Write a protein that binds this ligand. Structure first.
Ligand SMILES: [Mg+2]
Ligand SMILES: [Mg+2]
Ligand SMILES: [Mg+2]
Ligand SMILES: [Mg+2]
Length: 275
């Protein structure tokens, strides 16, 4: 994590009252999440051990260099600073979509910093900002194409654990049927649309008209988009079943996408493919 700017804070350990004061000062060069070029940032703040006593800075609109200047206290046992870290989270802020996380920072040696004083601005880097990592769900379907009239069966049964893209905690799933590399994107196929649910169940098929030899493309990449009326539809995840040596499960799933003219091609794949 680097393009994720830097944030300025100060911290003192008030004595007598045994509280740990913390001041969020400001941040520089935060990334530009929103499209207009800016970001509406704000930061969560909690004492790592107990991940449930958080604090929240006001949000600042359109600016990659917000000036917080907000102080929060944490009544804590003097010597308790031992087993205790400090977590900072900076998220973009949105009104309906899920809040993007820009970066976080961890203040390991909480003790030393007890140093001094209120005015002790001590910059730190905003980390975490590269590629994938976590989950997104995993969809299940069954491929089945017959050489006869040439019908590549792409029946989508269900999927589960889908990522919530709404703040409500849900998503309005549906899936797109497509291919890869060569293109053939001039031939897509969308499923139904199931409201508020992280484990849709379609039991719907996708009628295709492909040919024999043409099956050496090993191409058919599908994705789980989230139908949003407010903003525009976003892809929650994708799979591929194609020449993606990154997912053997699929390419094999392709080879065995014959032999037994239906069903078998079952055994869902992951969706941790953010395309
Ligand atoms: Mg935005
Ligand atoms: Mg916004
Ligand atoms: Mg957003
Ligand atoms: Mg929605």
């Amino acid at each position: 994590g680097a393009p994720c700017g830097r944030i300025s804070f100060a911290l003192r350990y008030l004595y007598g009252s045994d509280q740990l004061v913390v001041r969020i000062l400001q941040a520089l060069d935060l990334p530009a999440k929103d499209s207009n070029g800016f970001s509406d940032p704000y930061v969560k703040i909690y004492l790592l051990p107990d991940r449930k006593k958080k604090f929240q800075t006001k949000v600042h609109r359109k600016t990659l260099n917000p000036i917080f200047n907000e102080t929060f206290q944490f009544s804590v046992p003097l010597a308790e600073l031992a087993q205790r870290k400090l977590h900072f989270s900076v998220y973009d802020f949105d009104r309906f979509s899920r809040h993007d996380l820009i970066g976080q920072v961890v203040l390991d040696n909480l003790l030393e910093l007890a140093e001094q004083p209120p005015d002790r601005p001590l910059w730190r880097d905003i980390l975490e900002g590269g590629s994938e990592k976590a989950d997104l769900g995993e969809l299940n379907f069954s491929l089945c194409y017959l050489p006869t009239a040439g019908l590549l069966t792409v029946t989508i049964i269900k999927a589960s654990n889908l990522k919530a893209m709404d703040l409500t905690g849900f998503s309005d799933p549906y899936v797109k049927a497509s291919l890869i590399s060569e293109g053939r994107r001039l031939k897509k196929r969308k499923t139904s649309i199931k409201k508020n649910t992280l484990n849709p169940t379609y039991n719907e098929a996708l009628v295709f008209d492909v040919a024999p030899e043409s099956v050496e493309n090993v191409g058919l990449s599908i994705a789980v988009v989230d139908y949003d009326c407010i903003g525009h539809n976003e892809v929650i995840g994708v799979c591929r079943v194609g020449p993606e040596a990154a997912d053997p499960h699929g390419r094999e799933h392709w080879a065995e996408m014959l032999a037994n003219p239906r069903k078998p091609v079952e055994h869902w794949h992951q969706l941790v493919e953010e395309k």
